[PDB]
């Protein structure tokens, strides 16, 4: 990827096999969950678009999500070339061509062009935009892969509350809902769909109950 | 994490793959124990708030503990904002603004902001404050994750004394309390729930004796 | 491969033992997946023909596929030698001789000649041409290795649509077709070889629908 | 630990996660062999007291040995405070204050104070004294771990001499004695608890013989 | 291995532990395979004769093959000494003496001698000659270690054709022969020992046809 | 250990845990074989005597060989201090003390003294002499660990020739015999202690048989 030396000038570096080996293993080992997006965002930090394309191509299985993210990239590139028209026909000497919809992803562009684009003054954050698009695609994917909705989460008669609230927060984190509605529902749906005895205990405890108080009361 | 070294201090390197892979693997394998607190403190020595956010997002499972940690961090940030109010009006040129309560968590801040806040003269230890917040969160987590209390520990007729005291000290380390009462409770609880042979041995030895003599007394 | 030292001249670095260990391991571990080919493109970035030949020959097993790819390499070298004439005479400094088919293949060439050919101005992409030939051979072998043709996959009565489209895309990645007609298959056969219920659902929704919404409609 | 950059000033480098990973894994896997303390000496070469504290706290289980080593650390700190007086007053530049036992232990000190103490002229080996205390505690723990004493091992009728002397030296590495008396022990107890036939063989050969010729005579 | 790089070329680094460990693993795990010669050529690219000796001494088991390699190296060194006699009399000052037959194997030479020989002007490639000796020895070893000859290979009624041709080409690669007879023997041996159905198919296809059509003909 | 930088000036480096773990695994994994001495000579190349002492003290089990190597080190040190007397009483300014019998091993000498000795002009190869002494000790150890002598090898009625000759060459390489007597006995003991049918077949070939002929003829 891209590393910074103590001298001050950075150079290009090939993709290390350890990162991709971990990336192939993490996708297979963790399957699909909310935690995959951050790992992806932290592992591919400061990498060329070709590296991300190879990582998205070296994955084994789940080709449906790969086609989903490819169509998302295509739609984002179409919107980009629609909202950003090429008003300048000729190119000034010493300046490289503007990244188009197909050039921002690296389909018909070599690595040298991407290097010259990212090392420009000022730099063109093509890799950052590609990472944001991939993060949006992964958000859509994990939203589609939801086993169930948030309203269907109901604690059973004998199921413990720990795994119940764990699954609740797991299916809530992958939801595309905003922070406000999530904070609104986490105070009501957690107590309305709990064990009846515990539910009554938490309701009698007061309307200002926190996480630790609920954990200590619902287990007694 | 930020790197302070020889000439060329203006550098920022992302989280290494070996560190992040090790932390996710160790947390899943070790589940939750008091031990994780020092491992996290050693792995995040002088790290940026975004690095801490990525490390907290890389963990898979146990969503309830993560929500508890997040709400504790939010409460402590609110307390910090209440005790350290921000000054109104225009800011002085060249002087970096003080970090707000929400800026410590890294939810409404960027990389350059925390870089300038950490490399300022004098530096602002916001990363240390966030690490202390996460340490307090992990303390609350390991306190609420306890399966058996400290008073329900009794050695059986065939359980060894060494394993008994090992379990007792593990349970005591899992709980956080003042050491001034710990010194009394360990002595008033260790020599009470032992085997009758070890009990009469320690009674013949003396209450004010050390622990190594008790270990080497009833051994075998 | 070829690397550039910090503020230094272009020097040739040796083969990567850890990368080769991974490459031999991946083939055995991953059996023969289509994603293996990108894997080669990511591991052999800027590699020399000698390194590529060593990586090909170090593979244990698949001797039939090795013979097939060697035959394809020989055919490509013969076609190159037929389309490009060969000239002989004195070699002027700063200009290299005309590379032959066996020279592009690297069987009758040496490391110093390969370095002189790849570090000339303008550079002769002999390594790039050999890598393209190798990936074309691997594409041919993965096309022949397909157990099921692209037109032989049909959704069963109890097979989920997710697994159906996953297998369809996996077979499309391994089938032989051009990039333009590649969309025709995934646009027509994907809906023409599905379960009748979701067939009628997609027909009522609209053919121009995208994969995400068509799957969300087929799931419900 | 402390490292010296090439043609650079003495700077403190951060801790290595792989070292703690190897250290946590080896102690759990190898239980408590005498060599473990030696292993400790190689992993903690020139490390700060905070690093040793984190390495000791990160160990999972065996809280009894941790309490014992903490008690030994407290006793050593009290002895150091009793033998070395403490002075207070203005701190002159270039000269550090009098290190206290609580500061030698590193529980009530920070990182910069230890860095200034270890990089002063003349350097104050606080880390070396703490490492010596820790290895003494580990020696005490491995002595308590010895199931069989040095005088309780005897060669059986069917046990070979090789395994006998191996277990004898393994127990001698775990007993409490000085080197001067350890020489006499390994000289006389090796022949005092041996097999009678090999006892007579060694008596005919001579007590001053080395272990190699004694073993070669006992095998034949 | 020798390190030819920027200023400071006078440097000799020992073999890295990771490469030696990988060599030990690939020797222990796979025994001897037709692909071990490229593995040795890649792992020992540009190494000093002492490095080759250390690599050949760390081999585990198979002492007969190592003795065969040693005696072949000795015979070839004797042949080199016979064809390249050493000049008698005093040597010229400043001119390094030519390496003798036994000096190439590193049995009667030192490190400084071979360092000066490989870094002389012009350099003397004794390491390449020793690598050629070793790969010839390995070819003799893999030819001697052959279980089944090439004529005793017959496909059963149920064994697949792909596995049959894979085994055939593996046994053919294990044996070393001239290039002008192998292309004839493969064609005169493959289309005779196939399944009756596949035999009739290939008879309907044609003798002078390629191999890919034979593979895709009787598949399934 | 000791590494060489690109600049030209070398610095001290602590022992890496990976090499120590690999050595421990090799010792645990293969017990003792004549092949571990080259492994130790290639793994600890250019290491301080303290590193070798830690590696010899961190090993678990087989304390007899450790006592043997310690006694050999003591005897070599005694011989060194006997043959090298200290004729120079005073020490010149800027010059370090001469390594004595106890200083050459590192028992009563710190690491700084060893660094100053090895980096002197001219350097004092204390590490090389210590490595030679350890190699001699390991030679004595593997000579003592000989299951049996070289004369007891006799091929049974049904035992194959491959494993027979492998064990023969293994115990020959592990033997303390010189190069001449080994080559003298490898032509006689191999043919005189073989299967009678094969033995007569090989004797009917002549007195100029090679290893490949012995392998190919005995197996028929």
Strand F11-12 relative to strand C10-12: parallel, antiparallel, unpaired? unpaired
Sign of CA dihedral A135, A138, A143, A144: positive
**Cα–Cα distances in Å, from A18 out to A24, C5, C18, E87?**
10, 22, 9, 54
**Cα–Cα distances in Å, from D184 out to C141, D165, D176, D177, F75?**
74, 15, 14, 11, 18
* CA–CA gap between residue A63 and residue C84 (Å, rounded): 41
What tokens does B16 get? 């290494």
What E36-39 contacts at long range (C-beta under 8 Å, 24+ apart), as own/partner pairs, is E36/E138, E36/E142, E37/C57, E37/E135, E37/E138, E37/E139, E37/E142, E38/C53, E38/C54, E38/C57, E38/C58, E39/C20, E39/C58
At the fourth CATH level, the homologous superfamily of domain B17-144 is Human Immunodeficiency Virus Type 1 Capsid Protein (1.10.375.10)
* CA–CA gap between residue A98 and residue A120 (Å, rounded): 12
* CA–CA gap between residue E119 and residue E2 (Å, rounded): 9
Nearest C-alpha neighbor of D132 from the set D69, D85, D59, D179: D69
* CA–CA gap between residue B200 and residue B212 (Å, rounded): 17
Solving technique: cryo-EM
Alpha helices in D119-195 (DSSP H): 126-145, 161-172, 179-192
Q: Kindly list the residues from chain A whose CB atom is less than 8 angstroms away from the CB atom of residue B147.
A: none
Alpha helices in A84-178 (DSSP H): 111-118, 126-144, 161-173
Cis peptide before E122 (omega within 30 of 0): yes
CB distance B42–D58 less than 8 Å?
yes
* C-beta separation of B119 from B48 below 8 A: no
What tokens does A216 get? 């200590």
Decide yes or no: CATH 1.10.1200.30 for domain A161-218: yes
CB atoms within 10 A of CB F79: 11
* CA–CA gap between residue B66 and residue C88 (Å, rounded): 73
Q: DSSP letter string over D29-44?
A: HH-S-TTHHHHHHHHT
Q: Kindly list the residues from chain C whose CB atom is less than 8 angstroms away from the CB atom of residue E215.
A: 64, 68, 144
* C-beta separation of E162 from E215 below 8 A: yes
Nearest C-alpha neighbor of F63 from the set E140, A92, D172, D207: D172
CB distance D216–F14 less than 8 Å?
no
Q: Kindly list the residues from chain B whose CB atom is less than 8 angstroms away from the CB atom of residue A179.
A: none
B residues 46..85 contacting A (CB < 8 A): 54, 57-64, 66-68, 71
CB atoms within 10 A of CB E112: 9
Nearest CA of chain A to the CA of B106: how many Å? 15
**H or E segment to which residue C12 belongs:** strand C10-12
Strand D2-4 relative to strand D10-12: parallel, antiparallel, unpaired? antiparallel
Q: Kindly list the residues from chain F whose CB atom is less than 8 angstroms away from the CB atom of residue D6.
A: 5, 7, 9, 11
Q: Kindly list the residues from chain D whose CB atom is less than 8 angstroms away from the CB atom of residue F140.
A: 212
Residue in E with minimal Cα distance to C60:
E35
* CA–CA gap between residue C103 and residue C116 (Å, rounded): 13
**H or E segment to which residue D4 belongs:** strand D2-4
* C-beta separation of B184 from B153 below 8 A: no
* C-beta separation of B142 from B37 below 8 A: yes
* C-beta separation of A43 from A19 below 8 A: yes
**Beta-ladder partners of C3:** C11
Q: Domain F2-144 belongs to what architecture?
A: Orthogonal Bundle (1.10)
Cis peptide before D75 (omega within 30 of 0): no
Q: What is the CA radius of gyration of chain A?
A: 23
* C-beta separation of C174 from C146 below 8 A: yes
Q: Kindly list the residues from chain F whose CB atom is less than 8 angstroms away from the CB atom of residue E5.
A: 6
D47 φ, ψ (degrees, to nearest 5): -95, 155
Nearest CA of chain C to the CA of A165: how many Å? 26
Helix-strand-coil split of chain F, %, nearest 5: 55, 0, 45
* CA–CA gap between residue A9 and residue D40 (Å, rounded): 40
* CA–CA gap between residue C35 and residue C174 (Å, rounded): 9
- Give yes or no for B112 touching A (CB within 8 A): no
* C-beta separation of C195 from C212 below 8 A: no
Q: Given B13, B24, B60, which is nearest A4 (Cβ)?
A: B13
Per-domain boundaries in chain A: 17-144, 161-218
* CA–CA gap between residue A100 and residue D105 (Å, rounded): 62
E93 CB-contact burial (10 Å; exposed 0-12 / middle 13-18 / buried 19+): exposed
CATH of the domain spanning D2-145: 1.10.375.10
Q: Kindly list the residues from chain B whose CB atom is less than 8 angstroms away from the CB atom of residue D17.
A: 18-19, 22, 42-43
* C-beta separation of B48 from B114 below 8 A: yes
**Cα–Cα distances in Å, from A147 out to A144, A160, C220, F52, F105?**
9, 20, 12, 57, 66
Cis peptide before B140 (omega within 30 of 0): no
Q: DSSP letter string over chain E?
A: -B---SS----B-PPPHHHHHHHHHHHHHH-S-TTHHHHHHHHTTT--HHHHHHHHHS--S-HHHHHHHHHHHHHHHHHHHHHSPPPPSPPPTTPPPPP-HHHHHTSS--HHHHHHHHTSSS---HHHHHHHHHHHHHHHHHHHT-SS-STT----SSS-HHHHHHHHHHHHHHS---HHHHHHHHHHHHTTSS-HHHHHHHHHH-TTS-HHHHHHHS--
Q: Given B26, B42, B212, which is nearest D15 (Cβ)?
A: B42
Indicate the class that CATH gives domain E161-217.
Answer: mainly alpha
**Beta-ladder partners of C4:** C10
Q: Kindly list the residues from chain B whose CB atom is less than 8 angstroms away from the CB atom of residue D63.
A: 166, 169-170, 172-173
* CA–CA gap between residue B142 and residue B130 (Å, rounded): 18
Q: Pick the residue of A10, A22, A30, A38 with the most B CBs within 10 A to test the interface with B by mutation.
A: A38
On the question of a common fold for C2-144 and C161-219, the answer reads: no
Nearest CA of chain F to the CA of E137: how many Å? 11
Helix-strand-coil split of chain E, %, nearest 5: 60, 0, 40
Q: Kindly list the residues from chain D whose CB atom is less than 8 angstroms away from the CB atom of residue F64.
A: 162, 165-166, 169, 211, 215
**Cα–Cα distances in Å, from A82 out to A68, A76, E155?**
21, 10, 62
**H or E segment to which residue D12 belongs:** strand D10-12
* C-beta separation of F160 from F215 below 8 A: no
Terminus-to-terminus CA distance in chain E, angstroms? Answer: 50
Terminus-to-terminus CA distance in chain C, angstroms? Answer: 52
Cis peptide before B169 (omega within 30 of 0): no
* CA–CA gap between residue E46 and residue C126 (Å, rounded): 23
Nearest C-alpha neighbor of E116 from the set E12, E8, E24, E203: E12
Nearest C-alpha neighbor of B142 from the set B62, B55, B29: B62
Give the chains touching A; criterion: ≥3 Cβ pairs < 8 Å.
Answer: B, C
CB distance C43–A68 less than 8 Å?
no
**H or E segment to which residue F170 belongs:** helix F161-173
* C-beta separation of F14 from D1 below 8 A: yes
* C-beta separation of A38 from A131 below 8 A: no
* CA–CA gap between residue C69 and residue B33 (Å, rounded): 54
* CA–CA gap between residue A40 and residue A17 (Å, rounded): 15
What tokens does C121 get? 């101005």
Residue in E with minimal Cα distance to C54:
E38
C52 φ, ψ (degrees, to nearest 5): -65, -40
C residues 150..209 contacting A (CB < 8 A): 162, 165-166, 169-170, 173, 186
* C-beta separation of F65 from F129 below 8 A: no
* CA–CA gap between residue B138 and residue B34 (Å, rounded): 8
**Beta-ladder partners of D12:** D2
Breaks (C-N over 2.5 A) in chain B follow: none
Q: Nearest 5 degrees, angle CA F26-CA F32-CA F35?
A: 75
**H or E segment to which residue F113 belongs:** helix F111-118
* CA–CA gap between residue C163 and residue A65 (Å, rounded): 11
- For residue F62, is it left (φ>0), alpha (ψ between -120 and 50) or beta? left
* C-beta separation of E38 from E177 below 8 A: no
Strand F11-12 relative to strand D10-12: parallel, antiparallel, unpaired? unpaired
What tokens does E91 get? 């040597």
* CA–CA gap between residue B205 and residue E175 (Å, rounded): 80
- For residue B97, is it left (φ>0), alpha (ψ between -120 and 50) or beta? beta
CATH of the domain spanning C161-219: 1.10.1200.30
Alpha helices in C36-148 (DSSP H): 36-43, 49-57, 63-83, 101-105, 111-118, 126-144
**Cα–Cα distances in Å, from B33 out to B132, C140, D67?**
18, 53, 17
Nearest CA of chain D to the CA of F59: how many Å? 7
Cis peptide before A122 (omega within 30 of 0): yes
Cα A29 to chain centroid distance, Å, stands at 17
What tokens does A127 get? 């890799």
* CA–CA gap between residue F211 and residue F169 (Å, rounded): 12
F50 φ, ψ (degrees, to nearest 5): -65, -35
CB distance C215–A61 less than 8 Å?
no
Check residue A47 and report its DSSP letter. -
As a three-state string, the secondary structure of D70-102 is HHHHHHHHHHHHHHCCCCCCCCCCCCCCCCCHH
CB atoms within 10 A of CB F21: 15
Say if C and E touch: at least 3 Cβ pairs within 8 Å. yes
Question: What resolution in Å is listed for this PDB structure?
Answer: 4.4
Cα F50 to chain centroid distance, Å, stands at 19
Cα F5 to chain centroid distance, Å, stands at 29
Residue in B with minimal Cα distance to A7:
B8
Q: What is the CA radius of gyration of chain E?
A: 23
A133 CB-contact burial (10 Å; exposed 0-12 / middle 13-18 / buried 19+): buried
* C-beta separation of B65 from B140 below 8 A: no
CB atoms within 10 A of CB D83: 8
D126 φ, ψ (degrees, to nearest 5): -70, -40
Q: Kindly list the residues from chain F whose CB atom is less than 8 angstroms away from the CB atom of residue E144.
A: 212, 215-216
What tokens does F129 get? 């002499």
Nearest C-alpha neighbor of B80 from the set B27, B148, B133: B133
* CA–CA gap between residue F133 and residue B152 (Å, rounded): 59
Q: Pick the residue of C38, C135, C161, C210 with the most A CBs within 10 A to test the interface with A by mutation.
A: C38
C residues 9..38 contacting A (CB < 8 A): 16, 18-19, 22, 30, 33, 35, 38
Say if B and E touch: at least 3 Cβ pairs within 8 Å. no
What tokens does C185 get? 């298959």
Residues 6+ apart with CB under 8 A from B10: A8, B119
Nearest C-alpha neighbor of F144 from the set D170, D210, D163, D213: D213
Q: What is the CA radius of gyration of chain D?
A: 23
* C-beta separation of D36 from D145 below 8 A: no
């Amino acid at each position: 990827p891209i590393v910074q030396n103590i001298q001050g000038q950075m150079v290009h570096q090939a993709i290390s096999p350890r990162t991709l080996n971990a990336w192939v293993k993490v996708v297979e080992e963790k399957a699909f969950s909310p935690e995959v997006i951050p790992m992806f965002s932290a592992l591919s930090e400061g990498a060329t678009p070709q590296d991300l394309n190879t990582m998205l191509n070296t994955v084994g299985g789940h080709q449906a999500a790969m086609q989903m993210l490819k169509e998302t990239i295509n739609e984002e590139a179409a919107e980009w070339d629609r909202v950003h028209p090429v008003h300048a026909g000729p190119i000034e000497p010493g300046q490289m061509r503007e990244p188009r919809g197909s050039d921002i992803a690296g389909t018909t562009s070599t690595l040298q062009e991407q290097i010259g684009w990212m090392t420009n003054n000022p730099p063109i954050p093509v890799g950052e935009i590609y990472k944001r698009w991939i993060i949006l695609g992964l958000n859509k994917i994990v939203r589609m892969y939801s086993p169930t909705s948030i309203l269907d989460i109901r604690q059973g008669p004998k199921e413990p509350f720990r795994d119940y609230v764990d699954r609740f927060y797991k299916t809530l984190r992958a939801e595309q809902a905003s922070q406000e509605v999530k904070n609104w529902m986490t105070e009501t749906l957690l107590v309305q769909n709990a064990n009846p005895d515990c539910k009554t205990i938490l309701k009698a405890l007061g309307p200002a109950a926190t996480l630790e108080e609920m954990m200590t009361a619902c287990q007694g």
